[PDB]
């Protein structure tokens with residue numbers, strides 16, 4: 101019965117990642133004054149199915165890897181960590197209702213850089229390894245502002261419990277007291293997922309260009325699971341919805357609409373901006389977001405004390 | 415003779431300059447709105 | 458028999474999925490690149506057919522040779538074609554890719570890209586229009602639709 | 614008679630400095646760009662439904678070649694080799710002889726469509742409107758030599774497309 | 790226990806999809822490929838700057854590790870000391886950032 105709950109979590113994750121690709125191609129079509137896919141299915145609804153069947157019977161590139169074992173373990177780790185970030189998500193009830201769900205998510209997203217690192221070293225190209233090291237350095241850079249923005253917000257929560265974050269936002273959204281944290285958080289989640297304007301794995305060859313089309317589709321679907329997940333986590337964190345404990349589907353519809361609009365905001369940002377040069381997003385992290393994030397971390401430490409609004413522990 | 419020609423008075427005027435219409439609030443008003451949202455959230 | 462029916466339905470499935478998700482690697486060699494970009498432009502929009510805009514060469518399904526293949530770039534074309542995973546296809550766009558074209562008698566031009574790679578669709582024009590190139594891509598999809606891989610495998 | 618792009622010295626009073634700082638911190642031009650992209654989201658796209666909807670053309674359009682005939686069945690080509698003399702890519706190969714009734718007619722009229730640059734110098738060199746570059750652009754092949762047209766293929770293209778070619782020439786011959 | 794079941798299910802689904810993605814086109818008998826990089830054969834040049842940003846991540850991440858018990862630390866009854874040491878740790882992270890700044894450590898990956 102619990103395994104039914106695990107499958108009703110993880111199989112709709114795979115379906116929503118399948119159709120996020122279609123939604124991205126359609127929304128980027130209409131924002132680029134064209135259509136998206138509308139031939140393959142009715143309104144293109146069979147485009148992800150056709151494309152998945154195409155990729156799973158495409159020939160393997162059959163490369164020379166330094167490690168066979170890390171070449172197998174990098175997609176396994178990417179998919180496993182992409183699926184374990186969902187299990188504490190309170191929507192309105194988490195699958196695993198853990199007391200440190202925020203810190204668990206922060207740790208399991210910190211572990212996601214080994215997929216990039218192991219897949220880069222598993223490729224024998226030195227250029228793929230250099231691009232992998234640039235992607236890892238970008239990601240661990242933006243993890244700093246993830247951790248500190250998240251800490252500064254949870255100073256208003258009182259605990260690392262994700263389910264308490266619904267109770268925190270019953271009177272107001274937490275984007276009202278923490279909109280600078282919210283906007284730096286949103287750009288930091290944009291830079292965690294190698295998402296445009298921070299997609300330097302498509303700027304002129306990434307880390308996973310040496311895989312077959314099947315494992316490349318697995319990396320791709322882990323990345324889009326991370327995108328949908330970080331939008332849901334941002335929605336829980338700043339745009340927390342109303343919850344009737346006798347009608348949980350009201351909260352589910354509300355956070356689902358907000359998370360869809362936030363994922364479409366990711367799609368709409370990649371359809372609007374040029375890329376950063378690599379040192380420019382290093383400049384954006386280390387010289388712009390991190391001083392503001394430390395200043396607001398001091399502010400959200402000292403502000404519940406000066407207003408007498410320290411939240412409860414329990 | 416019949417030939418592709420402009421009409422009797424010629425064509426009407428054609429816009430060719432920049433038109434970036436200067437929308438949005440001032441900097442004072444935008445910082446005031448953001449600080450007011452901060453104060454509402456803190457309260 | 459029953460196995461004949463199963464390989465017929467499975468060939469129909471895999472051919473549907475391969476033709477309905479063609480990913481092109483376009484060689485922007487010469488003027489035909491501009492008309493490929495018009496076949497990607499919002500009037501014609503290859504992406505509504507599932508034909509994405511600028512897939513990377515290690516994951517592409519068709520190689521659209523759009524422009525003049527000179528002798529100095531013939532091994533680069535061959536190397537990219539060798540790096541493409543199967544089933545790979547090659548569309549020859551325009552007269553210089555087809556038969557050398559206006560530079561057929563040149564000292565420096567490969568007389569048609571078919572001397573270097575096997576070619577599936579020859580799209581004629583100088584340049585062929587973006588509608589004519591889209592016609593050639595739909596004819597390539599019809600060529601993939603009538604492939605008989607599992608049926609010939611079941612008969613071999 | 615000239616203008617200076619990007620020669621504005623920005624105002625340094627507290628109003629304009631606070632405006633630029635609000636633009637930097639509150640990302641006003643980024644929301645402007647998002648608004649323009651959102652404005653295209655709700656426009657009707659420009660995508661026609663090929664193959665069912667076709668791109669607009671004109672009677673001057675230079676597509677697939679055709680040999681034409683008179684309104685009696687006699688072919689117009691009288692073997693004068695002006696089209697292959699003017700041909701900038703030498704796509705046209707012509708051999709001729711007098712046929713059984715003594716008319717000056719071709720026995721070889723080849724057009725290599727993979728040398729052809731589709732510029733239509735042949736149809737304007739032609740003094741009898743025999744060769745035309747017709748309206749067809751959807752004639753892609755699966756084989757290279759299916760684009761090496763002989764006289765039979767060009768005459769069949771003329772018989773196939775004459776009802777359209779003659780009306781395009783009727784639309785355009787007064788400009789010629 | 791439910792967490793171990795969930796981790797095992799996620800790992801098993803990931804390993805299953807990886808095995809399917811690595812062995813479903815192996816059933817095809819496509820062809821044997823011979824196929825005889827921007828760098829030609831040159832050794833990987835070390836860059837000091839990537840190592841500096843990785844160590845700067847590690848040091849600020851240790852400072853983050855110190856900062857992580859603050860939502861529980863605000864519940865204390867020694868609030869003046871807690872607030873002083875909290876502002877002092879964020880200030881030392883800021884001073885580490887300023888020293889990394891002003892000695893050109895944040896340059897060409899700024």
Ligand SMILES: CCCCCCCCCCCCCCCCCC(=O)OC[C@H](COP(=O)([O-])OCC[N+](C)(C)C)OC(=O)CCCCCCCCCCCCCCCCC
Nearest residue numbers: 280282283286287334338369388389392445637638640643
């Ligand atoms: C979570 C829900 C959504 C959240 C909001 C996000 C939605 C909108 C997203 C739009 C698309 C963004 C795409 C990526 C853009 C990346 C570039 C970018 O913006 O860089 C950030 C830029 C970077 O600066 P820059 O690069 O533009 O400027 C040049 C920088 N120097 C000078 C160093 C060369 O700005 C920031 O870092 C600002 C971050 C937020 C700051 C918030 C400040 C709040 C107010 C503080 C007080 C001010 C008043 C004075 C004191 C008053 C005291 C009472």
Ligand SMILES: CCCCCCCCCCCCCCCCCC(=O)OC[C@H](COP(=O)(O)OCCN)OC(=O)CCCCCCCCCCCCCCCCC
Nearest residue numbers: 112115116119140141142144145146147149466469470473
């Ligand atoms: C949480 C919900 C998630 C939902 C996800 C999916 C959303 C979209 C679902 C699909 C919508 C309808 C798509 C219909 C496609 C067209 C099918 C069709 O008609 O194919 C015709 C083809 C040839 O037929 P033929 O007889 O030759 O035609 C000549 C007629 N004179 O015949 C064939 O090709 C053979 C028949 C193929 C039929 C395929 C139909 C679509 C399959 C979709 C599978 C997944 C559906 C969702 C599963 C979960 C919910 C139940």
Ligand SMILES: CCCCCCCCCCCCCCCCCC(=O)OC[C@H](COP(=O)(O)OCCN)OC(=O)CCCCCCCCCCCCCCCCC
Nearest residue numbers: 173176177180181184197198199200204790792793796800
């Ligand atoms: C190359 C190898 C393969 C790589 C791919 C697979 C591995 C990577 C992806 C999976 C990562 C596994 C993470 C396991 C622990 C996660 C942390 C954790 O347990 O947090 C949840 C929770 C803490 O919150 P709390 O509510 O306080 O505890 C319950 C008290 N009421 O604590 C609990 O609820 C406690 C539950 C019981 C304890 C669970 C212990 C799990 C088994 C040990 C680790 C197994 C994995 C080892 C390898 C990890 C990665 C290297």
Ligand SMILES: CCCCCCCCCCC1=C(C)C(=O)C(OC)=C(OC)C1=O
Nearest residue numbers: 114117118121148151152316317320321
């Ligand atoms: C368990 C398998 C589920 C289906 C596989 C993932 C969903 C299909 C995504 C297909 C896809 C699309 C549309 C796509 O556009 C794309 O290119 C950017 C991919 O990466 C190679 C893709 O993988």
Ligand code: SF4
Nearest residue numbers: 488489551552553584
């Ligand atoms: S076939 Fe002609 S128009 Fe096309 S790329 Fe070649 S030279 Fe340019």
Ligand code: SF4
Nearest residue numbers: 700729730732733735
């Ligand atoms: S269109 Fe030009 S290149 Fe083609 S056959 Fe006529 S004259 Fe020769």
Ligand code: SF4
Nearest residue numbers: 690691693694696739
């Ligand atoms: S097609 Fe015209 S120009 Fe060419 S040989 Fe015949 S009559 Fe002369």
